[PDB]
Design a protein around this ligand. Structure first.
Ligand SMILES: C#Cc1ccc(NC(=O)OC[C@]23CN(S(=O)(=O)c4ccc(C(C)(C)C)cc4C)C[C@H]2C[C@H]2C[C@@H]3C2(C)C)cc1
Length: 380
């Protein structure tokens, strides 16, 4: 068993996986210390600052603020979200091609220093704009769309609330499956047929719920706003012809540096359950594996370590198939089916929210088709 345990029931806190919200950051910080009010003002007013053409001049007038007053993980994660949103807005502007190739030192230096501390690249990633970018409206009500808000958006009407929160709610739905993983491995060591079966049925049930949460994206995200507006600010400078050499982080590196924009490969949920169920993805060969491994380096390092530990545990699939046990096989199959359905839905969302709007003004469609078929081929 690779997974380090905090006690007999819970995985080690060193993996930064919360029992209630999973890979998401629990109860995120909403305010920085007063010392950083100037950064908070800009991130909170990004929509009207971009729209009025005021954003860049405001960032250029900022004083240099040291990150030493960011003493705990939560305030460092908030600061990274604040500075990442400001960076995306500074670089892309209004999204018409008037790009900035130099990030000013009063942002670049604290952002790069903070990113070094957190071992995350100096660009907005999933762990910022989804996993840390949320609050409850009422502390005493549950985690539902109606009771939640994001902390930051880029433009009014960009649907970032719907896109980020629905994604967050899928992560939270998966958390109820992630917290069962130690029980799976314990039942395997102990030969507890029923415990393993109930654990797998629980996982499958939570993955099914996650897909029902995913369905909500159509109700909160307009495809034209997403494609023509939000995607601009999730774009990066790796292989981007508008920033062919990357971005200059003034006062941190002399040469421009390339970092990739957002990708679905930054969520740990898919790989977590592919590993658990022994599904090896092959679609797209080395170039796709290289890209996906690169996106794993854009997850929090503790979540990378969790995924690596999972790969070093005994195999659920090998255990199950050897039992002549219809019940274990059916429960395993229910998990695989729920993962196949999630991949299938992911493909249809890419189609409606990227491939189709793009057509109006191929390797991706065939990658997502192959990942779904590899998964379905893992049905025992
Ligand atoms: C910075 C940053 C940044 C901002 C957002 C993301 N989003 C992301 O990784 O979401 C993971 C998803 C997959 N989508 S998605 O709608 O197919 C989706 C997700 C991302 C995009 C991009 C524009 C970033 C390419 C496009 C689409 C269509 C939502 C979410 C729900 C289910 C399927 C997995 C999930 C299991 C949790 C990543 C980086």
């Amino acid at each position: 068993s690779g997974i380090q345990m905090e006690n007999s029931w819970t995985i080690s806190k060193e993996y930064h996986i919360d029992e209630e919200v999973g890979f998401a950051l629990p109860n995120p910080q909403e305010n920085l210390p007063d010392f950083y009010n100037d950064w908070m003002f800009i991130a909170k007013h990004l929509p009207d600052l971009i729209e009025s053409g005021q954003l860049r001049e405001r960032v250029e007038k900022l004083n240099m603020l040291s990150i030493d007053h960011l003493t705990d993980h939560k305030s460092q994660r908030l600061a990274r979200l604040v500075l990442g949103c400001i960076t995306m807005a500074y670089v892309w502007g209004k999204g018409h091609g008037d790009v900035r190739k130099v990030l000013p030192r009063n942002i670049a230096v604290p952002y790069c220093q903070l990113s070094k501390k957190l071992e995350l690249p100096p660009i907005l990633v999933y762990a910022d704009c989804v996993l840390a970018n949320w609050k409850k409206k009422d502390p005493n009500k549950p985690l539902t769309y109606e009771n939640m808000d994001v902390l930051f958006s880029f433009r009014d009407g960009d649907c970032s609330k719907g896109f980020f929160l629905v994604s967050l709610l899928v992560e939270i739905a998966a958390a109820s499956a992630i917290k069962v993983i130690p029980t799976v491995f314990k039942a395997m060591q102990m030969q507890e047929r029923d415990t393993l079966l109930k654990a797998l049925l629980e996982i499958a049930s939570c993955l099914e719920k996650a897909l029902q949460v995913f369905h909500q994206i159509h109700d909160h995200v307009n495809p034209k706003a997403f494609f023509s507006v939000l995607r601009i600010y999730l774009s990066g400078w790796k292989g981007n012809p508008q920033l062919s050499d990357g971005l200059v982080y003034e006062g941190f590196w002399e040469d421009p540096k390339e970092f990739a924009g957002g990708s679905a490969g930054q969520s740990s949920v898919f790989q977590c359950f592919d590993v658990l169920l022994g599904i090896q993805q092959t679609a797209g060969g080395g170039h796709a594996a290289q890209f996906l491994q690169d996106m794993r380096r854009y997850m929090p390092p503790a979540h990378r370590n969790f995924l690596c530990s999972l790969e070093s545990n005994p195999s659920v699939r090998e255990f199950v198939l050897s039992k002549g046990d219809a019940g274990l096989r059916e429960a395993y199959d229910a998990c695989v089916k729920a993962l196949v359905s999630l991949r299938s839905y992911h493909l249809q969302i890419v189609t409606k929210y990227i491939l189709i709007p793009a057509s109006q003004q191929t390797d991706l469609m065939n990658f997502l088709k192959t990942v779904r078929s590899t998964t379905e081929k893992s049905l025992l």
